[PDB]
Amino acid sequence: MAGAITDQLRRYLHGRRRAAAHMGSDYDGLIADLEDFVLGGGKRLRPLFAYWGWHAVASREPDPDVLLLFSALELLHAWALVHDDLIDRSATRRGRPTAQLRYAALHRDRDWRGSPDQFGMSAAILLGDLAQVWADDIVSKVCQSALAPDAQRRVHRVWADIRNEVLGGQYLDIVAEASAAESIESAMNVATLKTACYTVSRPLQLGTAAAADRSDVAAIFEHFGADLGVAFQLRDDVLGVFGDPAVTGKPSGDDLKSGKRTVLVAEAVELADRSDPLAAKLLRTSIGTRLTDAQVRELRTVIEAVGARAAAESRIAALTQRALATLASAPINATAKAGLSELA
Amino acid sequence: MAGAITDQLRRYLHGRRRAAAHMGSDYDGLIADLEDFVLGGGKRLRPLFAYWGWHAVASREPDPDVLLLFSALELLHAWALVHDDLIDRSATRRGRPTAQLRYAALHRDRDWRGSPDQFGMSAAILLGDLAQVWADDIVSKVCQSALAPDAQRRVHRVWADIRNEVLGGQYLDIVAEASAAESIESAMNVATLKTACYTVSRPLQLGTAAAADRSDVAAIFEHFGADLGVAFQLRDDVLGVFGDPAVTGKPSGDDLKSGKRTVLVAEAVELADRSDPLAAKLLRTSIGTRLTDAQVRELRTVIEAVGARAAAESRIAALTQRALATLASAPINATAKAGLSELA
Ligand code: DMA
Ligand code: DMA
Ligand SMILES: [Ca+2]
Ligand SMILES: [Ca+2]
Ligand SMILES: [Ca+2]
Ligand SMILES: [Ca+2]
């Protein structure tokens, strides 16, 4: 359960914090801020996928130290979110201020010298760096103490892949926005790395790798995550354009305001080339620019006008059905087929 | 030898780059930029300290995979330098442009959209992040394939300490400058984490931990690094104030221009309180501010006027002698006593 996975990470963070007390109260406040960020909210979706990858292949429920290994994905996710807020220059995340604004406010509260925003950015870099090195220390610690050497090697390869692919997905995304990549292929490649592999496939394989040597199941979870991950992305693309702010927690047409290069936006350009070339020109010359609220509503209606919203929904229903068809015929326990079908 | 340690890291980086080719030519260019930065210069000082910590306790020269483990300190150092250049907002490093300026120039070369400086900062964050996750993958890989399980646990604890202390030292340093910490104690605590532990003590213990279980030697290398590391810092403090730009590679009085909170600067304030209170007031009200070249020269002369330079030199000679006295009476091989005395 997510609660048992979070409590394992809570105790670990407490232990690392006590061991670092000799470095002063200022660094202790940064560690406490890391605790408040990781534990103070989240769905725990990635450790749950790792839990089912373990159940799909194993019989005994994982040891408590293995749940700590699954929680490392949550601490690793904090590193990604903290650095992503600097990359996106976001001021808030899920209603709470981002790291660079919390430490800039601390700078002003203490009447410190220099640029508060520069201190906030520097501290946010270090905050994300700490979440990464500590999330990795979990994997190294749990592997040496709780896993047979062959499970250690299988776990490390997944750990090396999930961090290499989330960094590649991040760099591919900023290059795609800077280069104005229109193609569905460019947006799909980012979604495969940032969403399919990072959220679904690699977490699933992390639990399977720790359980036993089942290359057949790991290769199947990759195809299962390739469909469910993209279906998750297209759902977010629709919510990012048409979602009600009372459900998404984000402004109306946020993806259009922020200028994301999404699959939905990319497919709207392709469908518009075939139905109204002037609507494709309206999309091309407006994506990623400073858009008023009226421009955003017009683009939202154009996206649904060319059938991009309906094309996305059918693409979601198809991928979700195939992912469940892949899950029903898998050589795994019927308990994981149920749990993973629930999440899907 | 540093050359054999670098060539191990060169082959590893090449292998990781080839394995990541499926993520496109843009990410491949970032990995090639990482190769050019880590391999295209450096003294390899930290892997050498790790080499002598191995020799001090062991008899057989380390395996080639162990030299790769020692090279992980160099790749980890790239992560620290890349993120430090963002923290310090530096434009060049050792005559070459920093990461945020290389990727901003790429942005302008490609006539890309948006802020080039924001893309450069975002790419620099990701570049440093990649150096860290790959430097850690070396440790995880070498431990599972080349070390007995007890050496793995000893290596991991040093790996967890060196990364936790360089992050704490970085945060303590920006807090010290923002809060205008005058005390020698504040500057010394930063020097112990950033220089003593990160450069000397923890690298030494990394090689000793991989060789055998010698808690006696590891505790001695900590005291040896506590003296040699601070002596290294005070030498840099003197060069940062009085050094010839033709030898330091940095402008005259760079520490005063950049506003570093060094031990030398802190001791100058204490000595001035006892000899000329108005000179201490001149230091206090000028450190960390926008200083003209005449203000810098005046502060340089005041620092030597109150005897802070002479006090630093005697403090360097004392620590260097004690570190060699600690090294001569150590229960280690006479080969490492020679090699480590050379570096000192
Ligand atoms: C690596 C990672 C999880 C990035 C977040 O994606 P995003 O920037 O599109 O959205 P948000 O900042 O809202 O999570
Ligand atoms: C963590 C680390 C090695 C920081 C560099 O020290 P610095 O910022 O005082 O100097 P430089 O940028 O010249 O290396
Ligand atoms: Ca982003
Ligand atoms: Ca973001
Ligand atoms: Ca610095
Ligand atoms: Ca610097």
UniProtKB/Swiss-Prot annotation, chains A, B:
- Explain how, and how many, cofactor molecules are bound: Binds 2 Mg(2+) ions per subunit.
This protein's pathway reads:
Isoprenoid biosynthesis; geranyl diphosphate biosynthesis; geranyl diphosphate from dimethylallyl diphosphate and isopentenyl diphosphate: step 1/1; Isoprenoid biosynthesis; farnesyl diphosphate biosynthesis; farnesyl diphosphate from geranyl diphosphate and isopentenyl diphosphate
A GO molecular function assigned to this protein is: metal ion binding
Any idea which positions bind Mg(2+) 2?
Answer: 84, 88
Q: Where does isopentenyl diphosphate bind?
A: 43, 46, 77, 94
Query: Is Lipid metabolism included in the keywords of this UniProt record?
Result: yes
Keyword set includes Lipid biosynthesis:
yes
Source species, domain of life: Bacteria
Residues spanned by motif DDXXD motif: 84-88, 236-240
What positions does the entry give for Mg(2+) 1 binding? 84, 88
Give the EC number(s) listed in the UniProt record.
Answer: 2.5.1.10, 2.5.1.1
Cofactor(s) annotated in UniProt: Mg(2+)
Q: Which UniProt keywords apply?
A: Lipid biosynthesis, Lipid metabolism, Magnesium, Metal-binding, Transferase
Which biological process terms from the Gene Ontology are attached to this UniProt entry? geranyl diphosphate biosynthetic process; isoprenoid biosynthetic process
Its recorded reaction(s) are:
isopentenyl diphosphate + dimethylallyl diphosphate = (2E)-geranyl diphosphate + diphosphate; isopentenyl diphosphate + (2E)-geranyl diphosphate = (2E,6E)-farnesyl diphosphate + diphosphate
Family to which this protein belongs: Belongs to the FPP/GGPP synthase family.
Role this protein plays = Catalyzes the sequential condensations of isopentenyl pyrophosphate (IPP) with dimethylallyl diphosphate (DMAPP) to yield geranyl diphosphate (GPP) and with GPP to yield (2E,6E)-farnesyl diphosphate (E,E-FPP).
Q: Give the comment on domains.
A: Contains two aspartate-rich DDxxD motifs, designated as FARM (the first aspartate-rich motif) and SARM (the second aspartate-rich motif).
- Please report the name of this protein according to its UniProt entry: (2E,6E)-farnesyl diphosphate synthase
**Organism from which the protein derives:** Mycobacterium tuberculosis (strain ATCC 25618 / H37Rv)
